[PDB]
Amino acid sequence: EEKEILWNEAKAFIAACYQELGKAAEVKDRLADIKSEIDLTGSYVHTKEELEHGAKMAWRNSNRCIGRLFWNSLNVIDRRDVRTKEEVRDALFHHIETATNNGKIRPTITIFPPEEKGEKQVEIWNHQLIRYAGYESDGERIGDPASCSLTAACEELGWRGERTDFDLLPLIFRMKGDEQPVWYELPRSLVIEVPITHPDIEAFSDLELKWYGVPIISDMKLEVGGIHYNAAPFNGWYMGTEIGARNLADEKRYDKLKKVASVIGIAADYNTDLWKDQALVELNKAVLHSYKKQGVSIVDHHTAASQFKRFEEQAEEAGRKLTGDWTWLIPPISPAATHIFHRSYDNSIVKPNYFYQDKPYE
Amino acid sequence: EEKEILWNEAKAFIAACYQELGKAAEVKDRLADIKSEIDLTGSYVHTKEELEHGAKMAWRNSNRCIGRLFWNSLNVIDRRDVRTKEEVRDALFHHIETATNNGKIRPTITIFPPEEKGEKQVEIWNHQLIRYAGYESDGERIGDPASCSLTAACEELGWRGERTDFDLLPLIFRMKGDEQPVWYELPRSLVIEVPITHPDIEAFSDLELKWYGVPIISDMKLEVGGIHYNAAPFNGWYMGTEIGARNLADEKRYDKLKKVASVIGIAADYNTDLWKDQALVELNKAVLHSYKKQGVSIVDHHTAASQFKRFEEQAEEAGRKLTGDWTWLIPPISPAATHIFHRSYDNSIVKPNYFYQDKPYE
Ligand code: HEM
Ligand code: HEM
Ligand SMILES: CNCCc1cccc(OCc2ccc3ccc(N)nc3c2)c1
Ligand SMILES: CNCCc1cccc(OCc2ccc3ccc(N)nc3c2)c1
Ligand SMILES: [Cl-]
Ligand SMILES: [Cl-]
């Protein structure tokens, strides 16, 4: 059964992958080899070419991602060789440095050994490799509420945060055979952060806002031809609205709109003044300006949607079905100013792809 | 078959309606009477109470409507007695006057005789009773592009627009047995319009924008207990974003964002300046301000979403399933600033309800 599903997924992936790589003639013999490997071993091992192309296909098939035009330039790092926690740490440190690239962000994925019997070899606890801690006790809220449960789990393990609003969480992961994860503080020299200033409004710096340069999502599973890479952190560059309309704006995140309204000099008293909307726009302008000024890659939602339109055109021209999740593709500010809002998308799930998986804490 | 569907819909509607009206004991005898009427006549006639409550249920079940908290206060006008085109005209004129109510808009529906054998008794051609004409010829675009086909159909019939950007379309409808519709110019004394000014930016009036006071949607079909009221125009008051983020903003409508950017004194050259977003906010602030200043009812999207949350709570408390269309419920500006964005909704279709129907032109 288990063995059956794997073979099926393998046939479908190898056929499609080799077709796109112009290697269609090599399919029959590769499939032969795979069949034997599965019979003999219970699993099979991707070639470097298969793994690289699979990770790229998986990004291409990510319905919720507006940034897919660049799927084929994904930088894929093969770390299936790691066996120790020092190696995993160093690979994660390396991913941060190489993806950051002094501000000129390279979309990158680092791929660790896959689940074996559904048994994880490496289990990453972080949601993103770089993220801020959150605390909630005695009515006191500090940092990022979205990080409260992971922060509490880290502190169970002997980590202690300084309780600023921007404590960097340690890297935290567990190896097969260890009962507990280990944690490592991030070297601050590896982590680019951007202070938020406004191009016109000088008081904006009074808010003392900042955000980190690179979102490196580290808790999703990459599935390629029936092989489950549960540990495979990847990154792009930010779209500005993720920071300005959600991370810094949401009431359940940093909740900064009233403070923004105050520093930009507008009242926050009447819904009809659209003060939240006006605050959102200025905060989002501040975020784009600040990343650009520091030389850290970022895309605004208009440019991003323009790129996505080209992705749609490229899909059509290549003869591939396009899939998408309208509810995630539309940006959270001025969505009707983008073409995405005015059409519909088929939300079918195509593999390879990235999937959610259960958290090991909570 | 036809006769069967009707009876089924009737049983389900009468049972639910009388239950809500505390008239459950009267169901058995009412259903008896209806059964006979259908056998004998092919159809059945709603009581005033059934019709009124059915139209209210239909609004309550409109998945795409954010304004549903007020479903039970719908003003229902029963015009099943009309037989002539002068009567239809006068009923439509009356609806405009009574709904407008000197600016204090009353949500109202005027209900005309229903389809008989699927044969319409009255066929309204207008999308809304009050709307602006649109023209497109020789590269010249004037008025509302959304009105181009209806405008062309009106001019086929001897109507002629002045070719301002805001020509009011005539009322246009067809009676059973007439080969052609008739048209009647709207008396300007019945139509409230609001000039768009900005609370802070005096130059905003240079754009010479205006919009009409009351959206009176006149091309949907009301279905109640298997009876098809294809002619049943209804209105609420506007939510400001419908005018400011769509009618005046969309590239395929009045397309005013570049002109807005110019009068508010910002460049429209770089996506990263978020000039479209900033223009959207100021235009939307202008719209709310202008309606309020003139004493014409309007709701902003924050207040509207707050009302909708109460509608959700009321549904739960009354033991009714809530249905909704997330993609239409979210406002087109700052959607993530509303609770709607952060939850999901079951998009099941429950009857009574309002439905699309084929246009008689195009
Ligand atoms: C190159 C720059 C990129 C940009 C600007 C971009 C933009 C975005 C945005 C805005 C979202 C929505 C996230 C949210 O609202 O929570 C998203 C979702 C997503 N992106 Fe991308 N992305 C990029 C690169 C990548 C890469 C390199 C991958 C993987 C190889 C990826 C895979 C995804 C996935 C899987 C999701 C959905 C996650 C979920 O379901 O929660 N993206 N992207
Ligand atoms: C009282 C004020 C009301 C407000 C503020 C309101 C608000 C809205 C808004 C903003 C939409 C979305 C329209 C679009 O984006 O194209 C909508 C859709 C709708 N509303 Fe309401 N509404 C109100 C009253 C009513 C009334 C009185 C009815 C009928 C009795 C109604 C039935 C509907 C229906 C059927 C739709 C969907 C139409 C379609 O599918 O195209 N609403 N409403
Ligand atoms: C706001 N939704 C949070 C829930 C959630 C859970 C797990 C992963 C996840 O990823 C969002 C995500 C994923 C990949 C991205 C790549 C680039 C980018 N700019 N944003 C990206 C954002 C998001
Ligand atoms: C933007 N969608 C246009 C397509 C379309 C076709 C037919 C009817 C229709 O109604 C939108 C609609 C319906 C009822 C409304 C009631 C009140 C209100 N403020 N807006 C309302 C808006 C909309
Ligand atoms: Cl993020
Ligand atoms: Cl409208």
A123 within 8 A of A360, measured Cβ to Cβ = yes
A340 within 8 A of A66, measured Cβ to Cβ = yes
CB-nearest to B277 from A272, A303, A334 is: A334
Residues 6+ apart with CB under 8 A from A62: A68, A353, A354
Single out the residue of A107, A121, A98, A219 nearest to residue A175, CA to CA: A121
CA B51 from centre of chain:
19
Quick check: is A339 in a domain?
Answer: no
Phi-psi map region of B22: left, alpha, beta (phi>0 left; psi -120 to 50 alpha): left
Q: What is the dihedral of CA B113, B117, B121, B126, to 10 degrees?
A: 100
The DSSP letter of residue B43 is: -
CB spacing of B303 vs A245 below 8 angstroms: no
CA dihedral (B330, B335, B337, B342) positive or negative: positive
Phi-psi map region of A234: left, alpha, beta (phi>0 left; psi -120 to 50 alpha): beta
Quick check: is B165 in a domain?
Answer: yes
| CATH code of residue A204 | 3.90.1230.10
CA distance B187 to B158: 18
How many Cβ atoms from other residues are within 10 Å of residue B313's Cβ?
Answer: 12
CA distance B213 to B303: 19
CB spacing of A300 vs B274 below 8 angstroms: yes
Residues 6+ apart with CB under 8 A from A47: none
**Which residues have CB under 6 Å of ligand 2?**
B 59, 62, 64-67, 70, 74, 107, 109, 234, 236-237, 239, 242, 299, 304, 328, 354
CB spacing of B302 vs A276 below 8 angstroms: yes
Residues 6+ apart with CB under 8 A from A52: A76, A78
Residues counted in chain A: 362
Print the domain residue range for A95: 81-106+121-192+356-360
Ligand 2 centre distance from Cα of residue A274 (Å): 21
CB spacing of B332 vs A335 below 8 angstroms: yes
A207 within 8 A of A196, measured Cβ to Cβ = yes
Ligand 6 centre distance from Cα of residue B291 (Å): 15
Catalytic residue among A50, A52, A65, A183: A65
Single out the residue of B127, B129, B237 nearest to residue B186, CA to CA: B129
- Residue with CA at minimum distance from ligand 2 atom 11: B65
Same domain, A158 and A200: no
* C-alpha dist (Å) from residue A356 to A75, A197, A223: 22, 35, 11
B161 within 8 A of B142, measured Cβ to Cβ = no
CA distance B234 to B76: 9
CA distance A262 to B123: 54
> Where in chain A does DSSP place strands (E)?
75-78, 108-111, 122-124, 134-137, 140-143, 171-175, 182-184, 193-195, 210-212, 216-217, 221-224, 227-229, 234-235, 238-239, 298-299, 353-355
CA dihedral (B354, B357, B361, B362) positive or negative: positive
CB spacing of A285 vs B274 below 8 angstroms: yes
CA distance B135 to B142: 5
Quick check: is A176 in a domain?
Answer: yes
Look at residue A188 and give its three-state secondary structure: helix
Which amino acid is residue A349, in one-letter code?
A: I
How many Cβ atoms from other residues are within 10 Å of residue A96's Cβ?
Answer: 24
A220 within 8 A of A356, measured Cβ to Cβ = yes
Task: Respond yes or no: is residue A68 known to be catalytic.
Answer: yes
Burial per residue of B322-350, b for 16 or more beta-carbon CB atoms within 10 angstroms, e otherwise: bbbebeebbbbbbbbbbebbeeebeeeeb
Same domain, B113 and B226: yes
* Residue from B61, B65, B95, B217 whose mutation best tests the ligand 4 pocket (most atoms within 8 A of CB): B217
The DSSP letter of residue A222 is: E
Q: What is the dihedral of CA B88, B92, B93, B99, to 10 degrees?
A: 150
CA dihedral (B173, B174, B180, B183) positive or negative: negative
Q: E strand or H helix at B123, and its extent?
A: strand B122-124
Residue of B241, B269, B277 best to disrupt the A interface, most CBs of A under 10 A: B277
Give the number of domains in chain B: 3
Same domain, A88 and A198: no
Ligand 1 centre distance from Cα of residue A151 (Å): 24
Single out the residue of B225, B95, B117 nearest to residue B171, CA to CA: B95
B199 within 8 A of A267, measured Cβ to Cβ = no
Which residue numbers of B are catalytic? Answer: 65, 68, 237, 242
Residue B110's φ and ψ, nearest 5 degrees, are -110, 125
**Which residues have CB under 6 Å of ligand 3?**
A 67, 215, 217, 219-220, 236, 238-239, 242
Same domain, A133 and A150: yes
Query: Which residues make beta-bridge pairs with B76?
Result: B109
Single out the residue of A181, A175, A58 nearest to residue A113, CA to CA: A175
Q: What DSSP assignment string belongs to B195-247?
A: E---SS-GGGGGG--EEES--EE-SPEEEETTEEES---EE--EEHHIIIIII
- Rounded to whole angstroms, the maximal C-alpha distance in chain B is 71
Query: Which residues make beta-bridge pairs with B172?
Result: B183
Catalytic residue among A242, A246, A253, A328: A242
Same domain, B178 and B230: no
Residues counted in chain B: 362
B234 within 8 A of B257, measured Cβ to Cβ = no
- Residue with CA at minimum distance from ligand 2 atom 37: B64
Helical H runs in A2-112?
A: 2-20, 27-41, 48-60, 85-100
CB < 8 Å to A276, chain B:
302, 334, 337
Do the bridges between strand B75-78 and strand B108-111 make them parallel or antiparallel, or are there none, so unpaired? parallel
Quick check: is A40 in a domain?
Answer: yes
Looking from the CA of A41 toward its CB, the CA atoms found within 13 Å total 11
CB < 8 Å to A334, chain B:
245, 276-277, 280, 332-333
Same domain, A42 and A113: yes
Same domain, B318 and B242: no
Residues 6+ apart with CB under 8 A from B122: B82, B88, B112, B113, B173, B174, B175, B176, B230, B231
CB < 8 Å to B276, chain A:
302, 334, 337
B128 within 8 A of B258, measured Cβ to Cβ = no
CB-nearest to A327 from B272, B277, B326 is: B326
Ligand 4 centre distance from Cα of residue B125 (Å): 15
Look at residue B111 and give its three-state secondary structure: strand
Same domain, A283 and A134: no
Residue with tokens 């077709």: A19
The DSSP letter of residue A95 is: H
CA distance B14 to B49: 11
Quick check: is A346 in a domain?
Answer: no
Least Cα separation, residue B200 to chain A (angstroms): 11
Look at residue A357 and give its three-state secondary structure: coil
Residue with tokens 């034997």: A36
CA distance B337 to A277: 8
Tell me whether residue B258 is exposed, middle or buried, using C-beta atoms within 10 angstroms of its C-beta: 0 to 12, 13 to 18, 19 or more. Answer: exposed
Tell me whether residue B298 is exposed, middle or buried, using C-beta atoms within 10 angstroms of its C-beta: 0 to 12, 13 to 18, 19 or more. Answer: buried
The DSSP letter of residue B330 is: S
A223 within 8 A of A353, measured Cβ to Cβ = yes
Quick check: is B339 in a domain?
Answer: no
Structure tokens at B265: 């004194």
Ligand 4 centre distance from Cα of residue B238 (Å): 10
Which amino acid is residue A151, in one-letter code?
A: T
CA A316 from centre of chain:
26
Ligand 1 centre distance from Cα of residue A107 (Å): 11
Quick check: is B171 in a domain?
Answer: yes
Q: E strand or H helix at B109, and its extent?
A: strand B108-111
Helical H runs in chain B?
A: 2-20, 27-41, 48-60, 85-100, 148-156, 240-241, 257-263, 275-294, 301-317, 326-329
Same domain, B188 and B286: no
A38 within 8 A of A10, measured Cβ to Cβ = yes
Q: Determine the straight-line distance between the first and last CA of chain B, rounded to whole angstroms.
A: 31
Task: Respond yes or no: is residue A275 known to be catalytic.
Answer: no
Interfacial residues of A (vs B; Cβ cutoff 8 Å): 245-246, 249-250, 257, 271-274, 276-278, 280-281, 284-285, 288-289, 292, 300, 302-303, 306, 326-327, 330, 332-337, 341
Please give the resolution of this entry in Å, rounded to 1 decimal: 1.9
Residue B152's φ and ψ, nearest 5 degrees, are -60, -40
CB < 8 Å to B277, chain A:
281, 284, 333-334, 337
Burial per residue of A254-268, b for 16 or more beta-carbon CB atoms within 10 angstroms, e otherwise: bebbebbbebbeeee
CA distance A157 to A168: 16
CB spacing of A276 vs B334 below 8 angstroms: yes
Single out the residue of A236, A239, A268 nearest to residue A334, CA to CA: A239
Atom of ligand 1 nearest to the CA of A70: 1
How many Cβ atoms from other residues are within 10 Å of residue B281's Cβ?
Answer: 28
Q: Check if B243 has its Cβ closer than 6 Å to any atom of ligand 4.
A: no
* C-alpha dist (Å) from residue B113 to B54, B99, B121: 15, 20, 6
| CATH code of residue B179 | 3.90.440.10
Same domain, B128 and B200: no
Ligand 5 centre distance from Cα of residue A122 (Å): 23
CB < 8 Å to B337, chain A:
249, 257, 276-277, 280
B221 within 8 A of B234, measured Cβ to Cβ = no
Single out the residue of A211, A218, A140, A136 nearest to residue A173, CA to CA: A218
Same domain, A92 and A135: yes
| CATH code of residue B313 | 3.90.340.10
Residue B19's φ and ψ, nearest 5 degrees, are -65, -45
CB spacing of B303 vs A272 below 8 angstroms: yes
A236 within 8 A of A108, measured Cβ to Cβ = no
Q: What is the dihedral of CA B303, B307, B310, B312, to 10 degrees?
A: -110
Q: What DSSP assignment string belongs to B287-315?
A: HHHHHHHHT--EE-HHHHHHHHHHHHHHH
Quick check: is A342 in a domain?
Answer: no
**Which residues have CB under 6 Å of ligand 1?**
A 59, 62, 64-67, 70, 74, 107, 109, 234, 236-237, 239, 242, 299, 304, 328, 354
How many Cβ atoms from other residues are within 10 Å of residue A42's Cβ?
Answer: 12
CB-nearest to A281 from B281, B288, B327 is: B281
Measured N-to-C along each axis, helices A48-60 and A2-20 cross at an angle, to the nearest 10 degrees, of 90
A133 within 8 A of A141, measured Cβ to Cβ = no
Single out the residue of A130, A104, A123 nearest to residue A193, CA to CA: A130
**Rg over CA atoms, chain B:** 22
CA distance B224 to B215: 23
Single out the residue of B70, B71, B21 nearest to residue B48, CA to CA: B21
Ligand nearest to the CA of A250: 3
Whether omega for the bond prior to residue B352 falls within 30 degrees of 0, making it cis, is yes
How many Cβ atoms from other residues are within 10 Å of residue A284's Cβ?
Answer: 27
CA A103 from centre of chain:
17
Q: E strand or H helix at B355, and its extent?
A: strand B353-355
Looking from the CA of B290 toward its CB, the CA atoms found within 13 Å total 28
- Rounded to whole angstroms, the maximal C-alpha distance in chain A is 71
Looking from the CA of B317 toward its CB, the CA atoms found within 13 Å total 6
CA dihedral (B21, B24, B28, B29) positive or negative: negative
Same domain, B136 and B207: no
